[PDB]
Amino acid sequence: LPKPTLWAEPGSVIIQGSPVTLRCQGSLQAEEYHLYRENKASWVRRIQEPGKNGQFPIPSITWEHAGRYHCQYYSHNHSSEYSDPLELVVTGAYSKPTLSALPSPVVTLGGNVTLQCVSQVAFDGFILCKEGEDEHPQCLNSHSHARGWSWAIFSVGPVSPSRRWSYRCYAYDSNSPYVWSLPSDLLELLVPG
Amino acid sequence: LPKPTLWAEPGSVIIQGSPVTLRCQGSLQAEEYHLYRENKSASWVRRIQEPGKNGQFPIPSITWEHAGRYHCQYYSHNHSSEYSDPLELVVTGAYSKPTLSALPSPVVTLGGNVTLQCVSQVAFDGFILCKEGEDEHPQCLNSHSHARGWSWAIFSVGPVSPSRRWSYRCYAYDSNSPYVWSLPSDLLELLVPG
């Protein structure tokens, strides 16, 4: 039976000391749940019999709150399968990095530009974001699947389209960073209203 | 004397069988031009009358070998301006194609998370992500990083396509603790005329 849906009411990448709630949507005939996982134990909200999901608010958050998050609505008899693991992130812990436009902040119409993200400390993890219109801050992380077999990944958060929203990826080797393979099969993202 | 700046007209990243046309502007005084060259590359040239027109370098049938970072430095009277900031020429479609699989699914809410995956059959190390434009050709973002000193990350993106309120922000975390990012940094906006 359908795995629940779990997102964060205000957002996912939050600043320490900010209100946040973890809303779980599943089958309306839901009586229990399942949350946070890093070592077995759980935050369960046994909702009566209404038509209002099972939220999980927290006024002040901490760094420990940061990790994976998955719910699991339980029925009078039926037990459902887990859902999508949520990536809650708390910011403002270490030394703020620097983002430098290469070469010039001024950029031509449809040009290329190298944005340098630096810091005073050694780091092998960085984030790039973007600011749109009505909506709020949106960032992207990149990780790799080196173990077993190699290929990178592109972790994106709260998306906000306007016109065309399609993604295509490439592949190459460091021997030649300018000569690349053929684009991938057009992947079209789906969004409700 | 001012520094020139070169750019492609049909775009900087193109496929085989497609026309490539680079352009390097400057001052209306100029007379000549200059092209790229690397650790084992070859240099080029073209001559100009006296007044400034456009300065163009064509390669109708594009080819992999032509794939390299470029440079432009013009000539005036007695001196020579400075060689413009390099601009990497990219030729695509050489080998085995990868697949893009938005795990665990492409369907996602406005404010839903998602992880577009690009896995390749052959052990590569350079992967670029490329969202397409409505009338604008796809804007491409590569993610490479350093090693020496104290490692830092650089986001090398292709054609810039400005849309709404512009602003960027940066962040840094540790390997052991990935769900904990540093404080925000300054804001950065890209400048594009009309």
UniProtKB/Swiss-Prot annotation, chain B:
One of its GO terms (molecular function) is signaling receptor activity. Its main location: membrane. One of its GO terms (biological process) is innate immune response. Residues 2-88, 92-194 form the Ig-like C2-type domain. Detected on the surface of all peripheral blood monocytes, neutrophils, basophils and eosinophils (at protein level). Expression levels are very low or not detectable on monocytes, T-cells, B-cells, dendritic cells and natural killer (NK) cells. The keyword Secreted applies. It is found in: Cell membrane. Part of the innate immune responses against microbial infection. Specifically recognizes a set of N-terminally truncated immunoglobulins that are produced via cleavage by proteases from a range of pathogenic bacteria and fungi, including L.pneumophila, M.hyorhinis, S.pneumoniae, S.aureus and C.albicans. Recognizes epitopes that are in part in the variable region of the immunoglobulin light chains, but requires also the constant region for signaling. Binds to a subset of cleaved IgM, IgG3 and IgG4 molecules, but does not bind cleaved IgA1. Homodimer. This is Leukocyte immunoglobulin-like receptor subfamily A member 2. It comes from Homo sapiens. The chain holds residues 26 to 219 of 483 of the full protein.
